[PDB]
């Protein structure tokens, strides 16, 4: 098929941001011309996800962050204080999973531990 | 300090399930001898997480699932229909983190694509 | 006979744990002073099994789980995802079964969980 | 799904043998027409196991033995010398588990003790 105007506006906003965006950040980024209700943002994000055009991950707090499917950024996160840093590059280096008759689009990879302040 | 009786009962239940459980599923799994209130389950889970004895991740739905920290099971999930399969083996088994005094506990690795039924 | 220090340390650890333990979990759980190589853990477990003091079962993927012989817990296991529930009671309690001396039984159920059933 | 030619060849060989077979025994049983690599045998057995079309049980040594899912044979085994005898019939007589939202396929039932030679 082809993208409706709301799906196109969300993909444009996700591409324009250098980072991931929460549903609320994405909602606040829309100007009058592109404006839609918050529930409409989430519905249209879900459709973009089902078409494999948007990726999602959750912070430890449960907040969802969205990005274009091609943005493959991974983090180290302290399980105590939640402090987080981005990895320089993806350590899988584009290698394929071993290969079950499943068409692969992307991976989320997140590392968890204790920062200097929190380590026992 | 050593693990109290409630912390031990939760670790036992998470080990016995062979996979992961939400806080509500963990609560429903406890036998008469291990049973405690739901708020007690959440408080004790949070403590186990902070001690690095339990790992947590979020499903695409935003539900939080818990497992023993050493249970390292990854999935393929269809972004269209939400069908999921567990991988028999971790494809990044033994990975080190690249580069200042951060103690690694675990990684979350999840693959997303289209299943046989959904692939265009 | 009587148990050597290594056999006693493994039986103590299996009794102290509220559930079954893999050989690797048992190995990691030992006190520093009683610690031994993983192959030594397996050799000593095999001796405890031969004396009828420890029971063993295998997960579908081949991992061995050990417990005191007296712990008679049975499971429902999904053959797809490996999700498991313990049965609250033994469903063959009181079952009947020359010169074979019976010590214990393993009883394990396999199927599809709600998520995996097509 | 449906069975590929390798899955069909393994099911045929397991049905043709009067009892259970290790992956290596199954591999050695295949004729020129049905032959495949050992790793292919294990991969295809694992798939059949996950689909509930073959049953698996482990000898005390850890060796995996496979059979058609409907073949329900149980044993008496000496824990000392490993000598084993088959039970003349299943004493559960097809009775169902008590009955959560779980579809039951089969049971493994194994008895353990000391043979005449072994009790000290
Ligand atoms: Zn921290
Ligand atoms: Zn990556
Ligand atoms: Zn690199
Ligand atoms: Zn699908
Ligand atoms: Zn892993
Ligand atoms: Zn399952
Ligand atoms: Zn029993
Ligand atoms: Zn014997
Ligand atoms: Zn039977």
Numbering used by the authors:
A (entry chain BBB), B (entry chain AAA), D (entry chain DDD): 6 to 104, 108 to 128
C (entry chain CCC): 6 to 102, 108 to 128
Original authors' sentences:
The structure was solved to a resolution of 2.1 Å employing single-wavelength anomalous diffraction with fluorescence detected at the zinc K absorption edge (9,666 eV). This approach was necessary because molecular replacement using a range of bacterial Fur-family proteins failed—indicating that SynZur adopts a structure that substantially differs from previously determined structures. The asymmetric unit of the crystal with the space group P65 contains four protein molecules. Interface analysis by PISA36 is consistent with SynZur forming a homodimer, with two dimers present in the asymmetric unit. Each monomer has two zinc ions bound with bond lengths that are within the expected ranges; one is bound tetrahedrally by four Cys residues (83, 86, 123 and 126) and corresponds to the structural site mentioned previously (site 1). Site 1 is located in the DD and tethers the C terminus to a region close to the second zinc site, which is formed by D77, H79, C95 and H115 (site 2). To confirm that this tetrahedral site is involved in zinc sensing, we generated a Cys95Ala mutant protein. However, electrophoretic mobility shift assay (EMSA) experiments demonstrate that the mutant is unable to interact with Zur boxes. Although some Fur-family proteins harbor additional metal-binding sites in an analogous location, SynZur is the first Fur-family protein in which this site is the sole sensory site. Thus, SynZur not only harbors a new zinc-sensing site, but also displays a unique orientation of DD and DBD.
